[PDB]
Amino acid sequence: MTMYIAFILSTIFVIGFVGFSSKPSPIYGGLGLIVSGGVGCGIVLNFGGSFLGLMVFLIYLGGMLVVFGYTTAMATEMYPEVWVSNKTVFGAFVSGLMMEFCMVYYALKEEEVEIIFKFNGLGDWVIYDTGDSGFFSEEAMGIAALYSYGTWLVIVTGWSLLIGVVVIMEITRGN
Amino acid sequence: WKPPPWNDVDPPKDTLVSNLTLNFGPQHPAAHGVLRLVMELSGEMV
Amino acid sequence: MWFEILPGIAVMAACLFIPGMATAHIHKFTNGGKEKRVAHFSYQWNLMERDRCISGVNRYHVTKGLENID
Amino acid sequence: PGIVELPTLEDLKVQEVKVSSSVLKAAAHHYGAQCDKPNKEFMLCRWEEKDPRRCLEEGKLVNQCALDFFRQIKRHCAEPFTEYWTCIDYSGLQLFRHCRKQQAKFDECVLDKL
Amino acid sequence: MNIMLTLLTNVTLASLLVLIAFWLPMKFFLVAITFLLFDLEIALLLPLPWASQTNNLKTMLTMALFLLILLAASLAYEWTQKGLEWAE
Amino acid sequence: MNPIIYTTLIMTVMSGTMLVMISSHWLLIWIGFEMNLLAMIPVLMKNFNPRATEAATKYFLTQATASMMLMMAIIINLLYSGQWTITKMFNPVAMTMMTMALAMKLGLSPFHFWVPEVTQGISLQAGLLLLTWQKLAPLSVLCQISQSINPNLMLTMAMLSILIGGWGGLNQTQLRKIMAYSSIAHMGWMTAVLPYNTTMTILNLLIYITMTLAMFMLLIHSSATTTLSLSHTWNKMPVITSLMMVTLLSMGGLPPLSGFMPKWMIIQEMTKNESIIMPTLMAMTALLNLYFYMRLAYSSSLTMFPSTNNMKMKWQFEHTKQMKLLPTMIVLSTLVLPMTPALSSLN
Amino acid sequence: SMMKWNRERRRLQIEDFEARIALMPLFQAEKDRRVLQMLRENLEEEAIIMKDVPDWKVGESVFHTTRWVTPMMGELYGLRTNEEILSATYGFIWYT
Amino acid sequence: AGRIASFLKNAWAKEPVLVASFAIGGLAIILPSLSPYTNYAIRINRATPYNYPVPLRDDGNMPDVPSHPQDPQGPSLEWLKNL
Amino acid sequence: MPLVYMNIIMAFAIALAGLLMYRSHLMSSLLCLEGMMLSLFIMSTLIILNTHFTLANMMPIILLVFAACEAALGLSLLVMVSNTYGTDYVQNLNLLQC
Amino acid sequence: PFFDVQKRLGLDLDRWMTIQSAEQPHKIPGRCHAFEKEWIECAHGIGGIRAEKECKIEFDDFVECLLRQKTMKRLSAIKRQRDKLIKEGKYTPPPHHLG
Amino acid sequence: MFMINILSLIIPILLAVAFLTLVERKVLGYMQLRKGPNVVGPYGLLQPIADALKLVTKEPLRPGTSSISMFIIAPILGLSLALTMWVPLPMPYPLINMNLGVLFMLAMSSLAVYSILWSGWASNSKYALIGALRAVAQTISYEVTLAIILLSVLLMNGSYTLSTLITTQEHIWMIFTSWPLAMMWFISTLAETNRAPFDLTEGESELVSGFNVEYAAGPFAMFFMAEYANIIMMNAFTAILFLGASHDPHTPELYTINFVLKTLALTITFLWIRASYPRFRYDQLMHLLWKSFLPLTLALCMWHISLPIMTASIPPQS
Ligand SMILES: CCCCCCCCCCCCCCCCCC(=O)OC[C@H](COP(=O)([O-])OCC[N+](C)(C)C)OC(=O)CCCCCCCCCCCCCCCCC
Numbered sequence A: 001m002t003m004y005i006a007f008i009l010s011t012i013f014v015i016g017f018v019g020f021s022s023k024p025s026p027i028y029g030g031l032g033l034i035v036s037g038g039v040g041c042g043i044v045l046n047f048g049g050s051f052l053g054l055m056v057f058l059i060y061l062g063g064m065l066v067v068f069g070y071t072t073a074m075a076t077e078m079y080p081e082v083w084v085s086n087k088t089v090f091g092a093f094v095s096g097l098m099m100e101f102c103m104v105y106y107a108l109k110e111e112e113v114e115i116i117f118k119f120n121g122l123g124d125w126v127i128y129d130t131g132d133s134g135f136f137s138e139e140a141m142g143i144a145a146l147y148s149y150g151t152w153l154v155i156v157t158g159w160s161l162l163i164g165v166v167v168i169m170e171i172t173r174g175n
Numbered sequence B: 001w002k003p004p005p006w007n008d009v010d011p012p013k014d015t016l017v018s019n020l021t022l023n024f025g026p027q028h029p030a031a032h033g034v035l036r037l038v039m040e041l042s043g044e045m046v
Numbered sequence C: 001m002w003f004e005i006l007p008g009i010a011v012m013a014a015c016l017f018i019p020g021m022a023t024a025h026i027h028k029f030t031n032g033g034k035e036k037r038v039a040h041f042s043y044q045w046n047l048m049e050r051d052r053c054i055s056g057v058n059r060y061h062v063t064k065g066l067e068n069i070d
Numbered sequence D: 001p002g003i004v005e006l007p008t009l010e011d012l013k014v015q016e017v018k019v020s021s022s023v024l025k026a027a028a029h030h031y032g033a034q035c036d037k038p039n040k041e042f043m044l045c046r047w048e049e050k051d052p053r054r055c056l057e058e059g060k061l062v063n064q065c066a067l068d069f070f071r072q073i074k075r076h077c078a079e080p081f082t083e084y085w086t087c088i089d090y091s092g093l094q095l096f097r098h099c100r101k102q103q104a105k106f107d108e109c110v111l112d113k114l
Numbered sequence E: 001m002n003i004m005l006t007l008l009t010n011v012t013l014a015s016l017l018v019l020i021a022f023w024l025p026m027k028f029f030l031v032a033i034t035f036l037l038f039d040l041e042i043a044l045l046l047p048l049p050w051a052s053q054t055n056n057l058k059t060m061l062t063m064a065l066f067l068l069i070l071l072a073a074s075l076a077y078e079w080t081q082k083g084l085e086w087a088e
Numbered sequence F: 001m002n003p004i005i006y007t008t009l010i011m012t013v014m015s016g017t018m019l020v021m022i023s024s025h026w027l028l029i030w031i032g033f034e035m036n037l038l039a040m041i042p043v044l045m046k047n048f049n050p051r052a053t054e055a056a057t058k059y060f061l062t063q064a065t066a067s068m069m070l071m072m073a074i075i076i077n078l079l080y081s082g083q084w085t086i087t088k089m090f091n092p093v094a095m096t097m098m099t100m101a102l103a104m105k106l107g108l109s110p111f112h113f114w115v116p117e118v119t120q121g122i123s124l125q126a127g128l129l130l131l132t133w134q135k136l137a138p139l140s141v142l143c144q145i146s147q148s149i150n151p152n153l154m155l156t157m158a159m160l161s162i163l164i165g166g167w168g169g170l171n172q173t174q175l176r177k178i179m180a181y182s183s184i185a186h187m188g189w190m191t192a193v194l195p196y197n198t199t200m201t202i203l204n205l206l207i208y209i210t211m212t213l214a215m216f217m218l219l220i221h222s223s224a225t226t227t228l229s230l231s232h233t234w235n236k237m238p239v240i241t242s243l244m245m246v247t248l249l250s251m252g253g254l255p256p257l258s259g260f261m262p263k264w265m266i267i268q269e270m271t272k273n274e275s276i277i278m279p280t281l282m283a284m285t286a287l288l289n290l291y292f293y294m295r296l297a298y299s300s301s302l303t304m305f306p307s308t309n310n311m312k313m314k315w316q317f318e319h320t321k322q323m324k325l326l327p328t329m330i331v332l333s334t335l336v337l338p339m340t341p342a343l344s345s346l347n
Numbered sequence G: 001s002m003m004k005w006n007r008e009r010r011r012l013q014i015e016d017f018e019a020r021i022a023l024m025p026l027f028q029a030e031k032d033r034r035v036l037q038m039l040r041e042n043l044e045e046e047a048i049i050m051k052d053v054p055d056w057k058v059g060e061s062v063f064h065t066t067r068w069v070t071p072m073m074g075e076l077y078g079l080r081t082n083e084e085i086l087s088a089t090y091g092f093i094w095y096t
Numbered sequence H: 001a002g003r004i005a006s007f008l009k010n011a012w013a014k015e016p017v018l019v020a021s022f023a024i025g026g027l028a029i030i031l032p033s034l035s036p037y038t039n040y041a042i043r044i045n046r047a048t049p050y051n052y053p054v055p056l057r058d059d060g061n062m063p064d065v066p067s068h069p070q071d072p073q074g075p076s077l078e079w080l081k082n083l
Numbered sequence I: 001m002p003l004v005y006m007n008i009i010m011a012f013a014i015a016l017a018g019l020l021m022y023r024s025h026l027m028s029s030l031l032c033l034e035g036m037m038l039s040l041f042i043m044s045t046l047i048i049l050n051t052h053f054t055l056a057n058m059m060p061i062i063l064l065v066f067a068a069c070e071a072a073l074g075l076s077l078l079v080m081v082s083n084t085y086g087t088d089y090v091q092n093l094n095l096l097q098c
Numbered sequence J: 001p002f003f004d005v006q007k008r009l010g011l012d013l014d015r016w017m018t019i020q021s022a023e024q025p026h027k028i029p030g031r032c033h034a035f036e037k038e039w040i041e042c043a044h045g046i047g048g049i050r051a052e053k054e055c056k057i058e059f060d061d062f063v064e065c066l067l068r069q070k071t072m073k074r075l076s077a078i079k080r081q082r083d084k085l086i087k088e089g090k091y092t093p094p095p096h097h098l099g
Numbered sequence K: 001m002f003m004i005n006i007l008s009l010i011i012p013i014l015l016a017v018a019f020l021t022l023v024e025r026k027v028l029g030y031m032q033l034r035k036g037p038n039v040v041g042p043y044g045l046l047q048p049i050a051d052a053l054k055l056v057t058k059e060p061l062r063p064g065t066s067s068i069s070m071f072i073i074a075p076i077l078g079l080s081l082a083l084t085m086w087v088p089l090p091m092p093y094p095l096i097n098m099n100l101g102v103l104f105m106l107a108m109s110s111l112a113v114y115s116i117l118w119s120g121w122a123s124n125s126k127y128a129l130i131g132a133l134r135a136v137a138q139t140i141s142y143e144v145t146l147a148i149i150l151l152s153v154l155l156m157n158g159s160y161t162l163s164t165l166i167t168t169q170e171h172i173w174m175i176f177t178s179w180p181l182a183m184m185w186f187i188s189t190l191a192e193t194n195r196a197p198f199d200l201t202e203g204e205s206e207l208v209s210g211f212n213v214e215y216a217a218g219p220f221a222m223f224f225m226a227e228y229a230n231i232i233m234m235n236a237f238t239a240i241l242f243l244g245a246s247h248d249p250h251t252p253e254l255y256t257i258n259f260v261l262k263t264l265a266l267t268i269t270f271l272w273i274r275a276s277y278p279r280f281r282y283d284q285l286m287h288l289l290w291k292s293f294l295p296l297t298l299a300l301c302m303w304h305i306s307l308p309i310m311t312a313s314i315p316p317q318s
């Protein structure tokens, strides 16, 4: 429909995870996460969070995952398994299908799913709050505090990234 | 289970190189024509 | 000569002209000779619903002014 | 635990100001400057009581004084207003920057006429 | 909605005109990992425009410039210890 | 490595745990755990040998996965209380989630198969860092949230460490493997007492830390990684083997050595908590540790072992490294039992 | 040149923000009545729908406090048709 | 001195991009400190009413706060007007 | 509680199962570990944006910039076992049997 | 903190964002700021074990604001018993329900 | 309503992309002293039609080593991306007024590299695979400078709203304020768009065709048109960024004339720049980027963040 669009996207998000959790060929597994990464931003986008969502596209989907499949490109064997290949991969995929079907069926009929966390099965929209945000975006004005309140965060995350640059050379140096 | 190496150095395996011998020449105007070249390289270094 | 590339250039200017006038004129047609009221923050949004709900015809673009109140 | 008290629909019925956004924003400066005390009373009540149902009466006066403000300007140069708020409407962001001459037209009644 | 409609229409147009064209007729790793670390460090200062309008921008000045010198510092250590001069 | 570049990697991880013990915010605790992992990997691969490459991979995958499991434990607690501060957890499954997540970072229960392999691959100098400093960071969080801990959840983790540490230690040959299993067995002792009173948890940590440095740096001086290789050191350096024996007895736990420091108070502490069957099993199964301590003690100094002719050449040259803090570490791990009432300082 | 122009834009924004400050009294008063008027229409409908159900105190308080909690949209719109729900919740987000 | 000047000259001889980068980065770190408009930037930054000026309960004894918005009492951004 | 969160919560669980179970390739395991922090990112943003916890918007950006540091380390280790063993299959990584 | 250098040095590194009722950019509320103010202000100087007992009512409300479990569960009873009345024709919607 | 605007945007974009092949062969020739396509069609007005029709009537070859699943998603992933990237362009009043449009444009620009990456894997040839491998690594290395240039430029502009570009750039072109970054930006456009001195893949002899090594007529239409499609826009993005025009609300015609002429002139320089320079060797790309372009961009971002603070010139995001 359109009311369940976040639910619809969330459903594609779960099945997208089964795509790469089943551990298919690394390129194909990356693609299964690429769509999973794509829809997940839309879930965030529907809740607001434009900037936080946009990063999932930019620095993760077009970022971390680009060099991810890039490594799989020059590595890996000469015979990449096609999604069907090993019967376990398709067995894992159908296995992921039966988990999301049983809960969703249970979610939309009895609405009293208690698996681990007790969760009531209503539409996505019955959780949004109310109120006007004035002239400032809540997400934009929050992470803009990186340089006004994010004092100890910047000092530590910056320092580790510099150590991140030095650790990667030291491991890749080859002594 | 064999005892671990005393120097802790496990024995190297054989070569794992990917020095593909590119066949330049009779497909690329880059070779100006009939200039079949046989040469190996470390991905980029001939 | 050199101007033989001009008709190749001119047709492009006609093609790129279409998006500029369309998305402007369509805005004028869908807003009633106006532009689409941008909503970059919450205030610009509930302002429209304020105007959309008062119009009675459920359109934000149609505006009722001093002739409406007494 | 217990019933949540909600004001009845009878006193809730209040004359709602039937004007658009452009007319409100065009005269917002003068509207805020002149009829402001009832707004401040309601504004303080909303932040102090923290309960909307306590200050609903002051909300009526906020509208009520708004009609008085719009009534006085209606008797005054309404035609310059129609010119002023129409050009303000023709702005996507309702920027006051574009409308200057018509803004001056409105400003030069209220300084002496009103 | 409009955003979804726009992207959906683009996919169909690409799909439609693809179909008519089908039925009718360590160095390599290092450049990847160095980009990854720089790109992640880049995402830190993306919120800079709105952050430039904070009410204590003096502290912003010390720390927004902090990340930028670390960007230089990470490259500087990379450059001096070979690094960007990739294996050849 | 370049001495200045190995220095910062050594003490970026020093700071990574330092953040954990001082952070009052849940995210910051994960931050210190991240720098803990990010600086641990290069040190494990200082020598660049396939054992180290395997050891780093096994260590990284285990610690990274535990870190990820820790995050959703943080998120669930946030999802149910909206509190980022470190206090008692406000939801059961979140409490159950991090206990296992923090356990895998430390490694006591079946999440312990990485501990032997990783230290076996990596060098002895990096072994002490992994087995001593890399245990304060997970333990600091556990001591912090001990109030909300699930008593059943932790204690079964505690025995499964000491029973596994006790049992498998008999069959181990490589000294690093034996040291790792004793570390697992020692890890169980303070984790068991953690729900009751964290003072003994810290007390067991400090003593165990002191004993392990005395063990590792002496082995570094011996330059030996196998029992037979350690056996030869009787002739060249008889004094070291004699000190090897006293710390083995100490770290065995026999009185009046400092190994009776943690157990006795731990035995006493749980006995005040009406848990009396629990201490007896741990004290009795602690003898499994003592057996391969005895096995090492027999082959090191108590009975001399055959040597080689070439090691007459070894006598002709003196040692070079000054093995800093070795003298004070040994004495602080053997004859500190009469200073038992000093445990009141920790609380 | 850009320094002078940017300073003018800041002058324009604070002028625009000032216009918002004047307009928010009426808007807050308008939304104040609207949000609780809709809540009452829920309450009157609530009485007619669960009069038959055995155990239900009409208008039962959700929170233990007697202080006015901000009413989330779920109880506000709720009963409204899916058109009203769709346009009001994901309205800002999908407006473009 | 002489070697330092020669060091810069040969730096500009073969490596002109980096000396341009270091010079610009070198400046860009120290004028914001001794800038005379930095305080102005803060002043106009706080002089942007994102949040409503919530009124205060008039209990007397406070003359600085204006009784009327147009009243002379209270802060003014006349400085922002000409600059 | 909204089904979108349970959709995310299983998304961790199915990602968790894939990371633990293993099939052949460490690339897939590294991929599975990324779905871990991914599903954590949407879950973090979803709660934080819903509750208007303004300062807490810190954590989503901070979360993945440090999770990506795992990729910087995890990807590097793979190529080394790829350089020495050949294929990065987990079965190859068995030298530390003792 | 295990080593509360935060308190000794008197300088803030992490407690700024620890709670949503703390200082916020441009003074915007954290949705449930009102409730968690009551709970925290109930719990100060009381101790962890005590506060979970006496300040339970405040915590239950604050969770209901934050978690919002039962409020929409009751709203579920509103809708489920609604469509289980219209489907047999026992209920008719007034015209303010639609427009 | 909305849909008629969608075709009114993408369709003229697509038809302009087909014609750009003509000028590529013509204005180069008129500089190369050649004549360019002239015989077919009056003044070569019909050559792109002849070009496009055989590509949609020639045999579409699927090499046996190519995965058909990967062989078909990639051309769609490329062409569609170029078209949906046009939706936030501020043509008087943009079709999509995404307040994060600058990030929106950049985000799917990174999504473009999956088009080449998958095609290089799909083709599955030794020479083809390395050709794409050392092609993607180029594009990703050029995005870091791309983001930094963007970040500095809109810092003086204001928020990331693409419509705000025309407001900040009211009296003076933004290039007069960031000309050291303009050429920094322009060369970056020359590299992501895969054009000489970064043609690399699509180089007629550099990689014979690079991403089109085994990839011929049929599906190849959506893989040699997409690169040319990004050319018109990424120059147009430069036109909005540094060469912004004036927009009268009562006559949006002026800004349509000005912007289209400005972006068309930039594309002429883009076609000018292929016919005047050699091709960078792979090492020279990184040497130019990481060691000269990357440090300079960082320094300029150092300068452009302090300057608004230096002169109290912070821009209003709203
Ligand atoms: C108060 C003032 C504040 C600001 C002051 C800033 C400093 C002063 C100004 C410095 C110059 C401007 C910034 C740097 C620009 C050069 C960057 C660089 O790396 O240069 C050297 C680089 C590299 O030169 P190189 O490789 O020979 O040497 C570099 C140094 N070593 C050897 C040590 C590495 O040159 C280039 O990149 C050449 C261009 C390559 C692309 C080919 C196409 C060029 C097309 C040119 C014509 C069209 C231009 C269109 C412009 C945009 C129009 C919209």
Ligand SMILES: CCCCCCCCCCCCCCCCCC(=O)OC[C@H](COP(=O)(O)OCCN)OC(=O)CCCCCCCCCCCCCCCCC
Pocket (backbone or CB within 6 Å): F237, F238, F239, F240, F241, F242, F245, F246, F301, F302
């Ligand atoms: C708690 C229970 C007991 C626990 C500990 C038990 C320890 C022994 C257990 C068995 C150990 C294994 C079997 C024996 C191993 C022997 C190890 C060894 O190295 O033996 C040979 C070695 C030869 O001696 P050498 O190193 O040459 O030094 C001689 C002195 N210069 O010998 C040595 O190196 C030993 C040197 C010993 C030096 C002793 C010095 C004594 C000083 C006394 C000072 C008194 C001051 C009094 C002051 C009074 C007023 C205050």
